Design brief:
This is part of a larger assembly, with 1 copy of chain A, 1 copy of chain B, 2 copies of chain C and 1 copy of chain D. Chain B is α+β, with helices and mostly antiparallel strands. Chain B is built from 1 helix and 2 strands; from the N terminus they run αββ. Chain B has a two-stranded antiparallel sheet with strand order 1-2. By secondary structure, chain C is mainly beta. In chain C, strands 1-2-5-4-3-6 form a 6-stranded antiparallel β-barrel. Chain D is about 70% helix and about 0% strand. Classes of the chains: A alpha+beta, B alpha+beta, C mainly beta, D mainly alpha. Chains in contact: A-C, A-D, B-C, B-D, B-E. At the A-D interface, helix 1 of A face helix 3 of D. Chain D: In the N-terminal section; belongs to the ATPase B chain family. In the C-terminal section; belongs to the ATPase delta chain family. Chain D: This is ATP synthase subunit b-delta. Chain D: It is found in: Cell membrane. Chain A: It is found in: Cell membrane.
Chain lengths: ~55, ~35, ~110, ~190, ~110
């Protein structure tokens, strides 16, 4: 069963995420297999976000 | 029959350290403590 | 013996290991950053266990540039430093690598 | 239908056996290709076509918590068995309800109904020996096998409630000092 | 009918009872503790209901040396102390047992 999990991890057209939380200028987004610490995220409204947590 | 069933159903201490750290630890099992 | 990074926040890094082998406390681990501009290797030290073959570690360098899925290798030893008679007369960093004359040492 | 129920019981048991797959399969995501690919790679030839399609649809849909994903298979199996039994509804419903009431009446067996770290099938054998409609017995065995630290009396009560709720009638408790006449009871039902 | 003990911590002890057996608030309960040298009889008073046939209470004696799974019995009554004219000229503890004479004052 370990091989299946390893292949699932190693398997990962453009990545898209969805917003789940808001309020007081803090957002929670998931669904991005390729992550990056302190990357600039472009929201559809033209505003920008910074990932300070993971 | 019910009591008989229970009677028929009626029919050496080790623990495992799940977590440890900072000088404390957590043990599982061992209901004879 | 291959590890996988699961969760990172600040300088503290979570890691998971295969059930067979898990390093003890205060064992150096090595990781790498694949980014072109900020390429660098990082050394980690074991802090505590959390169960499920999970380990908490503290980063020795700024953690910017890390990504999930990075392999982690261990050395099975504590952090080591060089000692000898001719050490006096040079400047050192935290890890023990020389600064005035890079590459000096590794024979004491 | 019996084969589909057996396959659903087996897949639910294997899913409950391992924790990692439940944790990884509950991730809320829009995409479904990796999940169905994993399902195909993980014993896709052990089940029939229709059950495989149903499982694929269930995995594809987004679930709030892994508990719902675990319980959906069991609920589907129970409703499939009930539908197969329907294809004598009143007799089966009365038998199941009276059986549950009379077994819950006994407190000693209810005390022994606690199941945790017990042998996986030993308690099943003991309970089936201790305690008849074929469908009712099969449903009882299925319910006994799939419980995990939960009240059995509540389980049988909920099973009877679901069975009567599949039909258009609504259950209602009635208390009186003695049993009324058949004509009076029919008039009460009419009222 | 009797219940069991599931959790113990500090002085507070919580116990479990079967259906239709939970006692009301402020009811005395007795528990048995056995050992080679520490044998006593724990006296507990009900504090609150936690639901699911669980009741949390406190104890009037040290909880050292107690083991889970020990049955707990109920008397269905509140704490009481003998009264009368004979109480004069004697020393009593909280439970009402006479400290001067162990057997005195057990009939009022």
């Amino acid at each position: 069963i370990e091989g299946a999990i390893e292949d699932y991890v190693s398997s990962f057209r453009e990545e898209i995420g969805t917003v789940i939380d808001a309020g007081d200028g803090i957002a929670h987004v998931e669904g991005l297999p390729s992550v990056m610490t302190q990357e600039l995220l472009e929201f559809p409204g033209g505003v920008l976000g910074v990932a300070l947590n993971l | 029959x019910x009591x008989x069933x229970x009677x028929x159903x009626x029919x050496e201490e080790i623990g495992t350290v799940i977590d440890a750290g900072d000088g404390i630890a957590h043990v599982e099992g061992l209901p004879s403590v | 013996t291959a590890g996988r990074v699961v969760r990172i926040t600040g300088p503290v890094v979570d890691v998971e290991f295969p059930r067979g082998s898990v390093p003890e406390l205060f064992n150096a681990l090595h990781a790498e950053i694949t980014f072109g501009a900020l390429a660098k290797t990082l050394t980690l030290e074991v802090a505590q266990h959390l169960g499920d073959s999970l380990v908490r570690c503290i980063s020795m360098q700024p953690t910017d540039g890390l990504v999930r899925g990075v392999e982690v290798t261990d050395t099975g030893a504590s952090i080591s430093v060089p000692v000898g008679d001719g050490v006096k007369g040079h400047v050192f960093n935290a890890l023990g690598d020389c600064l005035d004359d890079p590459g000096y040492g590794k024979d004491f | 239908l019996t084969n589909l129920a057996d396959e659903l019981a087996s897949v639910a048991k294997l899913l409950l056996s391992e924790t990692a797959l439940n944790k990884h399969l509950a991730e809320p995501t829009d995409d479904s290709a990796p999940k169905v690919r994993l399902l195909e790679r993980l014993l896709s030839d052990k089940v029939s076509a229709t059950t495989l399609d149903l499982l694929r649809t269930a995995v594809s849909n987004r679930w709030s918590t892994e508990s719902n994903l675990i319980d959906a298979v069991e609920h589907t199996a129970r409703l499939a068995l009930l539908k197969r039994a329907e294809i004598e509804v009143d007799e089966v419903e009365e038998q199941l309800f009276r059986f549950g009431r009379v077994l819950d009446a006994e407190p000693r067996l209810s005390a022994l109904l606690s199941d945790y770290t017990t042998p996986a099938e030993g308690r099943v054998a003991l309970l089936d020996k201790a305690l008849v409609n074929q469908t009712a017995a099969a449903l009882l065995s299925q319910t006994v096998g799939l419980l995990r630290g939960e009240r059995a009396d509540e389980a049988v009560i909920d099973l009877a409630e679901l069975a009567v709720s599949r039909r258009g009638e609504v259950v209602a408790h009635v208390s009186a000092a003695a049993e009324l006449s058949d004509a009076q009871r029919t008039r009460l039902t009419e009222v």
